Amino acid sequence: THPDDEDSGPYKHISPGDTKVVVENGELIMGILCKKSLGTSAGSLVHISY
Amino acid sequence: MDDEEETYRLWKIRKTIMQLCHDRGYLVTQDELDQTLEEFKAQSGDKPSEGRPRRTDLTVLVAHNDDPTDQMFVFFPEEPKVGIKTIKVYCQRMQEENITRALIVVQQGMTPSAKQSLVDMAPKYILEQFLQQELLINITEHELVPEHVVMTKEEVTELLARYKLRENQLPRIQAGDPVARYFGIKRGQVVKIIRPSETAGRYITYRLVQ
Amino acid sequence: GAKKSAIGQRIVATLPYIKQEVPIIIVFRALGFVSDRDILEHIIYDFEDPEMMEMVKPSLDEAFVIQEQNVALNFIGSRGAKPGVTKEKRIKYAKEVLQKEMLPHVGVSDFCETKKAYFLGYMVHRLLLAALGRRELDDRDHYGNKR
Amino acid sequence: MEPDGTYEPGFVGIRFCQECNNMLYPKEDKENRILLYACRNCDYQQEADNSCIYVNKITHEVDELTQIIADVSQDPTLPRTEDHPCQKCGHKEAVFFQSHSARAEDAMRLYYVCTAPHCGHRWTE
Amino acid sequence: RAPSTSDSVRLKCREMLAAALRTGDDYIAIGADEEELGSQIEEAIYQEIRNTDMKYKNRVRSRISNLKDAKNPNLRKNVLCGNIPPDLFARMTAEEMASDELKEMRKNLTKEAIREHQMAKTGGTQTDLFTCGKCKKKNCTYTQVQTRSADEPMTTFVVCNECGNRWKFC
Amino acid sequence: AKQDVIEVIEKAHNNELEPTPGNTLRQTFENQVNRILNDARDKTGSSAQKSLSEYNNFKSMVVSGAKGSKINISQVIAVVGQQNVEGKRIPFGFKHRTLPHFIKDDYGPESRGFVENSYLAGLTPTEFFFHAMGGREGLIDTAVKTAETGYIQRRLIKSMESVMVKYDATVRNSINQVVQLRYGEDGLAGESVEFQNLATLKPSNKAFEKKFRFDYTNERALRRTLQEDLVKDVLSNAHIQNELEREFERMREDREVLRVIFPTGDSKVVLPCNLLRMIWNAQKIFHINPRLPSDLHPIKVVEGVKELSKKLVIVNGDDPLSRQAQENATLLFNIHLRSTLCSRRMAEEFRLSGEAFDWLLGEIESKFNQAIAHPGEMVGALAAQSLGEPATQMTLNTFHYAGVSAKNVTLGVPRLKELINISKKPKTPSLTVFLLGQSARDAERAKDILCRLEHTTLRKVTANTAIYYDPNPQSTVVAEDQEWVNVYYEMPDFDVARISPWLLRVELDRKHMTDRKLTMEQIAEKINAGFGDDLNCIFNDDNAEKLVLRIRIMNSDENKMQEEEEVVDKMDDDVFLRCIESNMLTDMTLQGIEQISKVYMHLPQTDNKKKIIITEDGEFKALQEWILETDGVSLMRVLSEKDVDPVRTTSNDIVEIFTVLGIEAVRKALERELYHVISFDGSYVNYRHLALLCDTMTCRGHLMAIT
Ligand SMILES: [Zn+2]
């Protein structure tokens, strides 16, 4: 997603920043879904589901 | 002035034929493989009396692979364009020497009657023909070109048996293909192409010569 | 080959579906202006510039083989008309084509053969300007040049 | 000679026969050791004034102050300039422009034409 | 001593090298023998060439041309006073000459313009936006193609030339 | 920004801008204003995206990626920017003008097609018409691309249709010839693959050793009882130490082969299963706490991976050739599988238990065995549509060239059509020469090779030519040369009575002559060699202020005594001197000898991924350098020149590659060229499809264009 500070923000200690999406055991833990999560992407939720 | 390049070239083509002799397996000296430009210049003591028949002297024999069945013979004609007359004497020379294969490196081109005559030599001793400019650099070192290894007729028999194919059904390669010419292979022989693969890492193919 | 070589000066003319190309100076001689000083004047009446005049110079040299209007008409006829026998109809046939089919809009009569020659020359001049680069090529789409 | 010279030997591409009014061509006189010009269709002949018979390229006849007529000064579409001084007449106001040719040579440099009837003078800056 | 000779052509080449050394009378103020030196030069050239070939002749003339330069009489004066030995004069390997000055600058300037012919050719775009998630550099290019599109909308494509890496906006 | 453009126009009219490399001064100027206007659009574009509030629905559509994008926000809120057509600013339609509303020659932004307004404020009248011009290029492009791609796709399917994977899993066409021994060289399915990272390409040899090696010396860190449980009891085992030491020995050898396979250093490969996501599925379900101690025996891991390696059948057989086929074909998945499931990796990072690992082995076995492609399938047809589809996507003649040189390496569909036809005469053939190490870090060596490679004809080197009448040089009309004539009295002193009195004099440009580093004796020797001894040449010193060359023509002396009538038909020598002058220019091929000349440019590459080398630390490194890029084809000879790289020198032209490097080298080069054209959009067509395409065209030695 546009969000945060590519290349150096996640290293800025991970103040969860909520941007990045994490799903675990079939439950959405954090983040916001977009075309990169849901779209025709190589690693989208939809691809993994299939 | 251009004469001075020549020495680099004469060094350079001799070295490529050595690798060519070495890949065919004719056992050249490691030192001849290792021979530097400075040594070669030292070997013919450069700088004197130019246009001298160094190449007639450069003519070399090469003996071997695994079974000392005579040898292979390498000839550098002095003439820019070689005609049948030089070939006929050379033929007298190969016959006297009783050699089994002859490689001739012509500086510009061969007369078509000589190529014809080279064709008619096919039953007896084999004659192989390289254009000096294509030989002047080792093409087999180039990055595009995967490792080629020729197989014996027995290995081909086992290959066709184990996959259950016909000779006709394999991928073909030109008899004039620069690489096929490099090994000097004839029809019916198979080359094993070994390639790097993005997805296999290594991939092995075969091509029947056509 | 060893002619002078230089092909990039050899100006020729297609006349309307004449089976063969014709050199432009021959066309001028067919119009009747046999004097080279006059032909040169008709191409460019401002001969203060040696470069363009030198540029046409090998085509004048190429024309030299013939210097009579009748012969030049017979020449265009043979370069136009299928093979035959007499020369004279060929000159007449060549003459009516040269008169009527050559730029009809400037005239369709004998009495305006000279004026037509002037228009051919501005046209060769129009051509030479582009080859020197003195004048930009015409645009293939400029609506100003459409009807 | 000197570096600060020029090469305009006077390329005389025109010297027609005084009689038949056609072009003269070079030809040798070995007897007199002199170049002569003769018409091919007749005997008339005359000696040359130069040893040259042909030249090619100059590559840079930058051709900056020729062909372009002063009267271009009248054209309403050309930019009038408030930039002063006709280097000839003590009057400002000049029309200027550039290249306007296909042998553009890469001459981005501006050409200025004085517009008052006193010069018609054409310089460059 | 000057090495013995008998060939008439060699003798005249020495005479011309001597005659070139006579230019501007500098030889007088220094008082150095131009005939012995020209002979030593010529011998040294001949020791290189070993005959009187066109190439030797060209070398004699270029040696002559170096002596007859109007803008650099100091080269001759350097040879006349022995600041340049004949064996050095005999060879043009050691460059060509640089005391008329401006021409050396110009050749240097030529060496600039062909080096100017190397500079980037024509560097590109240079938008400089997003940081790459591989080689950690912001030097990046973006591609804008297919406007409106059929069903793959004018998405924004960003490529890191720095390591041939490409990703999309969002 | 507008004041800054007026400022650059002011500099340009002063004649002092100083041009950019390889460009005319207008191009330098045009490249510069174009940089300023683009920077102007992007600066305000970045300002508008900042200025948007959280609640902008327009930003909400852009961010989900639903429809539309950043540039649209730029155009509606900010400023629309420079329009262009054919990749350049709006042409001068009328005499030197775009519209009669402007002054002649007005390079300003607005006057030549920059739109200052946003769609929201509305466009001004000229901008609207220059915008309507920008509107056509896209409508027309649409109508053409639809016709061309429809045709390219049909031809492609029509070739490959009969190829298909047979039940012994070799891929063969209609007459039953073999295309591949295994489909896609591994026999996997394209819909079951995934992108994966190769752990063993990890930089630094020391770093690899640290992260992978299972230590036995046990650092005083609760060793043996930290992480692992009962494994503290097998620390005394000699056999277990030697077997793992054997494992690490395979990993150094695999790491060495894998470095040969991927010289560029990319870790992204398509492979089945995605072993890492599975380990995560495995950890998550069994409720594995990574802080709690382990419960897994290392030998169970090593042997289990061996057994799994044997279970992953892709080539059934038993004789030496089948074992080699099995081993080599799934080499890349096998080295990956050992790298992921490594004992030290398993124990430290993934913390899996014994039950979880045994289950994990069972799923990878089931997924890998399921991944193998289904024989019977139509593979040939499948590939043609996956190739056909990107020709559908984008670009017909749009220019996005960022390789700091010529447009060359034509982008998009017309280039695809060339590879598809194997055109004997491409519209824009090319060739990339890389340079030997020393000559690659130095400019001056690079300049000397560059001049040797270039192909320039004497016509380019000549400033001017003249032909003079001068029987007596000793009193030549060119009094300044007079000093040279005395200089050349001994220059064959006798046949001056015999040589023709006709003189050709040539003057050479000083900068251009120097640039080629030529010397006069080279020219004299070249021209002498071309025309012969009959062509008597003399020349002045290369250091005179007016560099000049003088040409005469000598005859055959003895025999020319007017025997019959002179078998030349009495050709005047002047006229003949023009033919000599013509041909001397058009023929003389010094340094470069054929069709390429100095077309050059020279380039510095630091941006790309070139010269990737190994270092003694073990890691990969960048090596910036000079490389020569040419616009012509002569690969056979150009390879043999000195200091030219005989290894990485390449050409985009597949017919020349065929002549020199044979059919296998075609198969690769054509793949790279087809991969490279698809890669411009970077939609990433799966490689297995292009391998199949290349194999069909190169199947039978001779090139089989699909025409
Ligand atoms: Zn006359």
Ligand SMILES: [Zn+2]
């Ligand atoms: Zn004035």
Ligand SMILES: [Zn+2]
């Ligand atoms: Zn990067």
